[PDB]
Design a protein around this ligand. Sequence first.
Ligand SMILES: CC(C)(C)c1cc(NC(=O)Nc2ccc3ccccc3c2)n(CC(=O)N2CCS(=O)(=O)CC2)n1
Ligand SMILES: CCCCCCCCO[C@@H]1O[C@H](CO)[C@@H](O)[C@H](O)[C@H]1O
Length: 332
Amino acid sequence: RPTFYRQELNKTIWEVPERYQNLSPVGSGSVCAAFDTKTGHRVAVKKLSRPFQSIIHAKRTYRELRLLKHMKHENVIGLLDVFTPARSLEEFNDVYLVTHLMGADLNNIVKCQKLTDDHVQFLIYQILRGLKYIHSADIIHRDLKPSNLAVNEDCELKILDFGATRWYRAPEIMLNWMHYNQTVDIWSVGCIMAELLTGRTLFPGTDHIDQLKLILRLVGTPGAELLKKISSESARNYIQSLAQMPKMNFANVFIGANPLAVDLLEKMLVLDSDKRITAAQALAHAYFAQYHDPDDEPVADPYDQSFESRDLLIDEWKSLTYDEVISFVPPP
Ligand SMILES: CC(C)(C)c1cc(NC(=O)Nc2ccc3ccccc3c2)n(CC(=O)N2CCS(=O)(=O)CC2)n1
Ligand SMILES: CCCCCCCCO[C@@H]1O[C@H](CO)[C@@H](O)[C@H](O)[C@H]1O
């Protein structure tokens, strides 16, 4: 067991192994940049806020640790370390997670640099590659957006979740549909890719209802085949309130873009989630010919999510969380 030290940062206490130096705030968990002396690389340290305050917080904490411990892929956040100051389960109250520091998020990149068609292919490729992995663990991101995409100076990318979001959100989540297939994240990729292509937000909605009106203007009112799958008597009427919008031709909308990019966008921004391209299918799309490698798009180990159906006591979640801190094995 390491020796820890205490530092006060923006009224927050931080007790970290000495391994980690130069803690320096990044925003409010709360997150600090730090320098890892055992590697001479810079890292990001997240202190979980109030990990065990309620049963629900406790199950969230356990959910995060289990997920981050499972994710082992180049385009997805991974765990370099997980620690606690506690010497014992009785003392256990704080969890810290450690991962690679990345320099910038995709928003930053898009704002001060017009990307070439090659850049869009590499960036979107990598998002689909991490997504193929995450989806293969039967996980749904649900909040994919540029601020959740960490990008290095070689334009290499990792998917994570820091925790308007509405701009990249599938229309079924904003109509609280409740089922949700993994292609809600594919919706998000089409929004992001459209924005990499034009330099502009595709659906900059003012609020919830503006968001939907903007979506329907591009992709049109639900066609007969979609209207047929909507079980909810209520929803059906609410939809057939909205103005009878035609689907726009995307070739006309993204005027000077690679015709392969347009075609992929048509296959991502489909109202019907059953008709949306999957991440694995998209990786086979001709727009990615220069990057696609079917022997290097790995899938995840089976992921035991049986905890999700469990309603347990705070201290049981806490004990489970503590077990997982103990059993952690850092990467090579
Ligand atoms: C694999 C994917 C889907 C992409 C992923 C990664 C993360 N979470 C994450 O990225 N944690 C972070 C973020 C910044 C960090 C910065 C420094 C160090 C560690 C850091 C850990 N989530 C969300 C999550 O864990 N829960 C579970 C808990 S919840 O409250 O249910 C919300 C979703 N999903
Ligand atoms: C007016 C706004 C129309 C929103 C249409 C969103 C329909 C998305 O697609 C629907 O996704 C569900 C998964 O959650 C599936 O159960 C349905 O089979 C599928 O058609």
